[PDB]
Design a protein around this ligand. Structure first.
Ligand SMILES: Nc1ncnc2c1ncn2[C@@H]1O[C@H](COP(=O)(O)OP(=O)(O)NP(=O)(O)O)[C@@H](O)[C@H]1O
Lengths: 486, 477, 486, 113
């Protein structure tokens, strides 16, 4: 009397639902029955698994094989269930040490020969396996795709016999390949570049250290895009989970989604024309928009006012929710879309000014926390090279990490996501600072949101100098990052 | 003799219809036949049940097994029938004494090892079992979801052998494990003043004003003004939640739900549900608050359907051969924009049908002045609790007068309760001369006046109360 | 060992995905259990292969047979699997030396006499076999269709016994037909048919030069569809890299009589009623829509306002990327649709004008680059006959080839495919040009997208004028092709 | 059956203008009496008459005159009694737009009112 239990994943989409494979060997006539809403693609696993076991010089039981793909309420649309089933059968026949199986998760499609074949949609599987801290074994054909995850806890095999010998004799199998070291280091940006615009640089630094969204404004060719691409270097390095989640969102796009290196916080910048289906959602099938590839990264609304107002209105959903459900029909998918927003606008040179600025999305413009002006450096100043830049990016990055730790000490929310109650409770806002606020806002006719965003920015620059309490100088300097338009 | 009975439950919508699985062992060549309308997930239970019985060291009968899970006309879809069928087979073979399972219900799907596995959407079955005064044995994995009832007799087990020993020798199963703001809105004055009596009287309210001025903030705050849900109401809310497969919060099941649907307004997601039906956004707000953010942006059709449950408390939806109620009692809140001519005329023409006209109350929000915006939160004295006590006593007196709130008063009842003495009648005609309110406008004015009259703890309505009530009217312009 | 492999090709859409046929012999009771998603083979091929093997005097195995058709997640429908399965069975029974199959593909269906029959849709298999550098053996009847590819290493046997002899004895089996030649002669249509429409002709020619999308407007009967019908002859001749792709796309629908016009670009002009499924994508196993036939070619859409809005919404994806990636929610098919788009419309017949203009698709108009108003011919111009027979179409085609060759000697895209930044750095645009362009943009409310479109048209016309840089004269000339609607 | 006390009171029905032809009249695949049939021996109320679609109003003629509706599944024909009394409501709105608005009213249902 014996039975075996084996674990695998069904990749119905971004999520990887855990699935338990169970085999029981009755002493009845040698049938092979499958339960658990097995589709045709998997209900036909019988003969292929049988031949794979036979052709690997194992013994196929002459007994009533019963297979259960739990849970029974969800259909098994995947195809990689074959290797878990074969391993379960071999374990039930006591040809394998059952003790080792408890810690391992298996995915694999086997040809009739017993050699493995690579299934599709493996990135969500490895993400889920890592989050569950399970040793994952997959077909060698998917090692190239698995490599971009940067794991050290995933193993690949060429044939079922190799998996059996790793289980028994500990052959350790072929691990996934080396690091993608074939790249240009420092992302060719690092920091300490951009010779001019000192004020814009430290404004960007404080925005990065916090979580504030910042809108750039200036003349063409003076800045914007350069600072935007440089910003990605200041954000702290992604943990394993964030990198794997970015890989999962990239993977559903199909193919090898992009061999543009990895593990850095993604920068996305859709063109202002684009489309509502490409920026957000997936339309008829479940796909993530560019808003979602920016998850744990930066979304750059390059030339903001040319965007469609409806898309900008939609953008307000996940920026606060953290995900944007796509209620297409009869079902929906989450697709997390939390990102550090950055925007760029051109002031242009009468009625024309209002007629142009009327296209600005007021709800999104009000949500954007920071604004700074970019001056042109003129053709005369660009001739002189960088002249001893003395790269210092690591200090600023560690400052970012320490600042985020300081935020987490109070609450998980960064200063940009603070509500009014928590914001007011955090800034001690002494008597003199209160009088200063009343004076300056008597001077400047701000609204409620303008007042609260000012408080949040002031608190951020207060944390810039390790001050438990805000001071008048902090608010005075933070005041320079507001007063939209003219 | 070789016949057995076992009660269980099947879920279709909110109601957990009773199901009697019946096992008869014949004497012919062994076979496993199942009868009664069953989705293939149910007729696939043969192998799971056989393996579970075998691996639990019982004896699987070598006889004709006929399983009837009646009634025959009701289709069975749930995966939970594995445990009832296993217990029926064990009882029919007399391995388990029959008398022990008389007043019990079994729910759970079986893995091959005989371990019980958690099924989805269990809570309605728990409620039905409690109502029918039956013991309910469930898989251990469902203990977390069933924990939001505090009920006894809900003993849960990990594997089949535990249940077998419990029935045979009485070994105790595991009991179910025990259970684990209005502030700010600076200086808004009139808006919160109106919203307080709106909560008191269950009235629907429409807020007008510029966006980004506290409308959503106050709407979210409105949730804690309502009283805590009773035990039955909280249980029903947990039941409707359990259909969509989540109960991750705790500490909050007693508070009324709050939902803010998006203006995209996909019909099948906002209301009702396709396939085996699922609760919509409207039904998730049961006993709670439904906030129609940006009312004019909604399409006509969804709100036209929504008018019916607003007046009836339920939204009937049906497949070809079914009929589902899906209770949807909720409180309505909506928002609109005053606009800065023909453009404003078409804007107000584009409003969402005569659903706005039967909204009970309306209030115009004005932007905060700067000085109250300065005022630090040194005025943080609690205010939610006292207003909740007011509201609780208010529902108490309103229910004592009649079995409904002032919002749900029928035509004759409101005129019978709102006495409107000669002094008040002498006034109403002059404002019916300054204005041209419809019959329903007059009636909702009367309901609001009655609510305010209660607010002053008055047995009768007075002229001052009607004058105060008149301010919270005059929808649009 | 009772194991054999046999590679082959199957196609959905244009791509001919590789498929590995696997045959395993077992000692159990005689049966033919085919596995892998098969719609016709699973129930028809297992019968034909038996008779084909028997009647060719081979020994059919008196043993259990399991046949695995490659990737299990990919549904397969081509009938030509009979020959691969038969050869797999023969190799598994060691009546054929399995070592010789290492570098070959097989395609064809077997009659009961062992004779091969011509399979449908052979061309994509030939293309895939060549690019994979694989010897391809096909039915004799398919020689005429495969011949247009002209590739070596292709053999067309008559019967299974001939293939067995070639594998065992290496006899020269069959060379390909002797490469039918085109010797292109147009002999039809020609640009000379367009009497009197000087402006429309020059606009049409420079639109061909720049690959721009062009919209025709004006009174009916001015020659709208005639312009489109004659446009195709001005495009450059398709190379084999393009001609083979177009032939593969066309063969998917049915028949292929192109031969002499086989290298000319194709032209489609669907009527506005149509149906979305026939015009784009298709049911059944995926079939190509009316859009995909215009690949590498031209698509004409007269009566644009009368199209149902679904078509005009969906056309954005292929018009941008050259592919549609249509999906059935089970799989997605790329279905390339690289084309040049020509539109035609009547500019309105009161608020009826407002409704008529509102029914226009802005997302399609947004990248409609060229617009020209065509009047009805004048009477005195209509009096004159043709009076000359110079076939100027060839000269215009030569001009188009020259312009496209120079553009490809520049960056890898034509003016039409240039983005904003590439369009910026391509054109010199001295100070006088910039200031005059700013002045004209002040005089009429063109957007930045219209600004870039005008710059693209100006670059095209300047290149046509043999000018090294864009001048103010070229901007003045290009301005006439704008001001859509009154 | 909410019955035994109020059953003898003649039925009342008020279908919404959205509804569905298959549920308002007859029933798909397994036959089931439509919402028109429930008003039998009672009153059927049609608020906002013009907003109904043409096909349903065309089919309304058959039960009004014959007292019954026959639904055909092409395998057999099934009769559902539909003798009822009809009450309708409509309203004009602010020009010749009034003329085209009233033109939407179904001609052969209106003359049977
Ligand atoms: N009276 C007030 N007291 C305190 N904070 C307020 C008040 N009015 C507005 N706010 C602030 O305004 C923000 C929320 O405004 P609110 O308009 O309710 O949300 P919203 O998302 O902007 N609704 P919408 O305009 O549709 O986007 C929060 O930062 C609140 O702190």
């Amino acid at each position: 009397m014996s039975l075996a239990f084996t674990k695998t994943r069904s990749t119905i989409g971004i999520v990887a639902q855990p699935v338990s494979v169970e085999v029981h060997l009755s002493n009845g006539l040698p049938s092979f029955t499958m339960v658990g809403l097995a589709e045709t693609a998997v209900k036909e696993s019988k003969d292929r698994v049988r031949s794979a076991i036979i052709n690997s010089q194992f013994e196929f039981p002459c007994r009533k094989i019963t297979v259960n793909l739990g849970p029974a309420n969800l259909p098994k649309t995947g195809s990689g269930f074959d290797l878990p089933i074969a391993l379960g059968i071999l374990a039930a026949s006591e040809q394998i040490p059952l003790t080792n199986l408890a810690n391992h998760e298996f995915i694999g499609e086997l040809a009739l020969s017993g050699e493995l074949r690579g299934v599709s949609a493996i990135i969500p599987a490895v993400l889920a396996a890592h989050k569950d801290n399970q040793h994952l074994i997959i077909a060698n054909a998917n090692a190239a795709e698995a490599s971009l995850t940067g794991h050290q806890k995933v193993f690949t095999a060429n044939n079922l016999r190799e998996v059996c010998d790793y289980l028994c004799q500990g052959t350790s199998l072929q691990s996934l390949p080396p690091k993608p070291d074939l790249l240009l280091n420092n992302y060719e940006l690092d920091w300490s570049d951009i010779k001019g615009q000192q004020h814009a640089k430290n404004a960007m630094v404080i925005a990065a250290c916090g979580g504030h969204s910042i809108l750039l404004s200036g003349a063409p060719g003076s800045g914007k895009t350069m600072m935007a691409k440089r910003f990605s270097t200041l954000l702290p390095e992604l943990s394993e989970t964030q990198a794997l989640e970015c890989a999962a969102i990239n993977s559903i796009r199909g193919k090898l989604p992009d061999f543009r290196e990895w593990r850095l916080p993604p920068f996305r910048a859709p063109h202002h024309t684009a489309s509502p289906v490409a920026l957000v959602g997936g339309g008829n099938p479940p796909k993530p928009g560019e808003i979602s590839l920016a998850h744990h990264g930066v979304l750059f609304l390059d030339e903001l006012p040319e965007f469609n107002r409806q898309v900008l209105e939609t953008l307000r959903e996940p920026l606060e929710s953290g995900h944007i459900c796509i209620s297409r029909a009869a079902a929906q998918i989450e697709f997390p879309a939390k990102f550090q927003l950055i925007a760029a606008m051109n002031p242009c040179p009468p009625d024309r000014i209002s007629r142009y600025l009327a296209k600005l999305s007021a709800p999104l413009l009000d949500r954007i926390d920071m604004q700074v002006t970019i001056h042109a450096l003129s053709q005369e100043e660009l001739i002189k090279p960088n002249t001893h830049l003395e790269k210092q990016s690591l200090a600023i990055r560690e400052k970012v990490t320490k600042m985020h730790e300081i935020q987490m000490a109070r609450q998980d929310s960064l200063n940009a996501n603070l509500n009014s109650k928590t914001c007011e409770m955090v800034c001690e806002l002494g008597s003199e600072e209160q009088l200063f606020l009343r004076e300056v806002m008597s001077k400047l006719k701000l609204s409620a949101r303008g007042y609260h965003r000012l408080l949040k920015v002031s608190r951020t620059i207060a944390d810039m100098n390790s001050s438990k309490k805000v001071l008048l100088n902090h608010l005075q300097q933070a005041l320079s990052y507001k007063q939209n338009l003219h």
